[PDB]
Design an enzyme around this catalytic site. Structure first.
Site, PDB file in Angstrom:
ATOM      1  N   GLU A  35     -49.805  -1.746 -12.827  1.00 32.49           N
ATOM      2  CA  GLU A  35     -48.426  -1.522 -13.221  1.00 32.49           C
ATOM      3  C   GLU A  35     -48.084  -0.028 -13.075  1.00 32.49           C
ATOM      4  OE1 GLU A  35     -46.777  -5.358 -14.338  1.00 32.49           O
ATOM      5  OE2 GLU A  35     -45.898  -3.442 -13.858  1.00 32.49           O
ATOM      6  N   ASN A  46     -34.725  -1.027 -11.933  1.00 34.55           N
ATOM      7  CA  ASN A  46     -34.575  -2.350 -11.348  1.00 34.55           C
ATOM      8  C   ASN A  46     -33.117  -2.632 -11.009  1.00 34.55           C
ATOM      9  OD1 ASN A  46     -36.745  -2.871 -13.921  1.00 34.55           O
ATOM     10  ND2 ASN A  46     -37.415  -3.004 -11.802  1.00 34.55           N
ATOM     11  N   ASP A  48     -31.081  -5.050 -11.954  1.00 31.11           N
ATOM     12  CA  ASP A  48     -30.274  -5.737 -12.949  1.00 31.11           C
ATOM     13  C   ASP A  48     -29.823  -4.782 -14.047  1.00 31.11           C
ATOM     14  OD1 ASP A  48     -32.643  -5.266 -14.278  1.00 31.11           O
ATOM     15  OD2 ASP A  48     -32.446  -7.182 -15.393  1.00 31.11           O
ATOM     16  N   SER A  50     -31.868  -2.795 -15.734  1.00 32.98           N
ATOM     17  CA  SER A  50     -32.991  -2.442 -16.610  1.00 32.98           C
ATOM     18  C   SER A  50     -33.927  -1.426 -15.938  1.00 32.98           C
ATOM     19  CB  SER A  50     -33.802  -3.702 -16.959  1.00 32.98           C
ATOM     20  OG  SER A  50     -34.523  -4.164 -15.813  1.00 32.98           O
ATOM     21  N   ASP A  52     -38.353  -0.394 -16.274  1.00 34.98           N
ATOM     22  CA  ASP A  52     -39.685  -0.623 -16.799  1.00 34.98           C
ATOM     23  C   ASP A  52     -40.295   0.691 -17.254  1.00 34.98           C
ATOM     24  OD1 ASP A  52     -39.832  -2.927 -14.295  1.00 34.98           O
ATOM     25  OD2 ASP A  52     -39.908  -3.506 -16.436  1.00 34.98           O
ATOM     26  N   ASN A  59     -40.194  -3.831 -19.992  1.00 35.18           N
ATOM     27  CA  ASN A  59     -38.824  -3.885 -19.478  1.00 35.18           C
ATOM     28  C   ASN A  59     -37.767  -3.702 -20.550  1.00 35.18           C
ATOM     29  OD1 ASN A  59     -36.274  -5.811 -18.423  1.00 35.18           O
ATOM     30  ND2 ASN A  59     -37.252  -4.555 -16.872  1.00 35.18           N
ATOM     31  N   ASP A 101     -44.708 -14.659 -26.142  1.00 38.03           N
ATOM     32  CA  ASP A 101     -43.723 -15.558 -25.532  1.00 38.03           C
ATOM     33  C   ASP A 101     -44.383 -16.635 -24.689  1.00 38.03           C
ATOM     34  OD1 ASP A 101     -40.490 -14.079 -24.950  1.00 38.03           O
ATOM     35  OD2 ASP A 101     -40.981 -16.220 -25.118  1.00 38.03           O
TER      36      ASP A 101
HETATM   37 CL   LIG Z   1     -39.807  -9.154 -19.725  1.00 38.18          CL
HETATM   38 NA    NA Z   2     -42.274  -4.923 -16.523  1.00 41.34          NA
END
Ligand SMILES: [Cl-]
Ligand code: NA
Ligand SMILES: [Cl-]
Ligand SMILES: [Cl-]
Ligand SMILES: [Cl-]
Ligand SMILES: [Cl-]
Length: 129
Positions: A35, A46, A48, A50, A52, A59, A101
């Site tokens: 990452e 990103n 959209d 957002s 990271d 995110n 999640d």
């Molecule tokens: Cl996420």
């Molecule tokens: Na991420």
């Protein structure tokens, strides 16, 4: 800060990630390598709206607040700045929630692409963990 591989493994183990929600320690070390290249200040913007943030590339749509992302839920209840710190505490804490999640570690693009189903114990080779 750029962590050493076994340096990071030890801190991730200290903070309870070994086997957490079914993911042995090497999964988390691998996810951080791919990452962020173990860089605590890595960022990825990103499409959209957002971003990271940090060593685990968490995110900003659902997990932290940076003040500029749509659909904001800030479910770790933290500024995204906290995820850019030189110690890993905030990132590890928020990752525990993220992984809880139904997605599990599929939330991490780099884990999905370079770590899932691989020999993740290689990542803690020679660390004595
Ligand atoms: Cl996420
Ligand atoms: Na991420
Ligand atoms: Cl190291
Ligand atoms: Cl620590
Ligand atoms: Cl492992
Ligand atoms: Cl922030």
């Amino acid at each position: 800060k750029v962590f050493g591989r076994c340096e990071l493994a030890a801190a991730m183990k200290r903070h309870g990630l070994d086997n957490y929600r079914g993911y042995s320690l090497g999964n988390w070390v691998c996810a951080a390598k791919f990452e962020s290249n173990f860089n605590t200040q890595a960022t990825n913007r990103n499409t959209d709206g957002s971003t990271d943030y940090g060593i685990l590339q968490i995110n900003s749509r659902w997990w932290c607040n940076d003040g500029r992302t749509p659909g904001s839920r800030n479910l770790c209840n933290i500024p995204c700045s906290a995820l850019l710190s030189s110690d890993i505490t905030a990132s590890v804490n928020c990752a525990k929630k993220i992984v809880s999640d139904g997605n599990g570690m599929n939330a991490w693009v780099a884990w999905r692409n370079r770590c899932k189903g691989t020999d993740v114990q290689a990542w803690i080779r020679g660390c004595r963990l």
